[PDB]
Design a protein around this ligand. Structure first.
Ligand SMILES: CCOC(=O)/C=C/c1ccc(N)cc1
Ligand SMILES: CCOC(=O)/C=C\c1ccc(N)cc1
Ligand SMILES: [Mn+2]
Ligand SMILES: [Mn+2]
Lengths: 137, 137
């Protein structure tokens, strides 16, 4: 069967600024780069940045809610979010509708998130404060 | 410090066909559903389906290369691909890289992939046959 996410590939319009964002600003590990892409890791996540002439820099009001959340500890969350804010990283959402999260944009407008907590923790929180119509299996 | 992918959220135009696709066709575990979304798991992956009226059913020629690859074993790959083909799931690309890959579309045109092989395997192949301009770190 399927066993998890093998990799996340993000199309990017400008390779070097995207590599810098994920490696320098977000702290991910850069393993290789080439004329048309890069490979990074974030823990066990394999991230591929793929140079794509079709990628547009997309304002958050023009894209749907598809987004990518990265795990961070409770101890590190607030100072990492504040650093992104002080660095001028654009945002796309303010209301914490799914727990402790910080919503921010990459250089092309990919919707990213810092989140504290697992799926099990989110299910437990939702039992007390469920989303409208929620059922648990 | 970021420690991995926390969750992947896909915006969906119609919740019931997307739940059918990810749970029934792709075999993911459904943990909860509410009036505007669902939570599933696939191994370590926490997947959220978020009902979003801004999601367009998007032809693959009209989206960029951003895509989401799921892990499967080599032994299971061909029968899972045949299952998707029997269900009429569209393919958006042929495989031309190392490691088996099947490139298929979700009901809203999200670009998905089945892939066999790790980042380490890809890096080993690249060190033997580097892409144009490739540098390692
Ligand atoms: C199309 C370019 O392809 C490459 O692999 C370039 C890599 C690179 C890495 C670090 C630099 N300071 C400059 C260039
Ligand atoms: C596109 C990459 O931009 C940056 O890296 C900019 C600033 C920065 C400053 C302090 C940090 N701890 C990390 C990053
Ligand atoms: Mn999220
Ligand atoms: Mn891929």
């Amino acid at each position: 069967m399927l066993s998890g996410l093998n990799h996340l590939t993000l199309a990017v319009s400008q390779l070097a600024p995207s590599v810098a964002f994920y490696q320098q600003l977000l702290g991910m590990t850069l393993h290789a780069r080439w004329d048309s892409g890069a490979y990074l890791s974030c823990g066990d996540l394999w991230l591929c940045l793929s140079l794509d002439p079709q990628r547009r820099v997309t304002p958050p009001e023009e894209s749907d809610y598809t987004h990518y959340a990265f795990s961070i500890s409770e101890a590190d969350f607030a100072s990492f979010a504040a650093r992104l804010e002080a660095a001028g990283v654009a945002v796309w959402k303010l209301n914490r509708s799914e727990g402790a999260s910080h919503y921010f944009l990459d250089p092309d407008g990919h919707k990213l998130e810092l989140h504290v907590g697992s799926l099990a923790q989110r299910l437990a929180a939702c039992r007390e404060q469920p989303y409208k119509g929620m059922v648990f299996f």
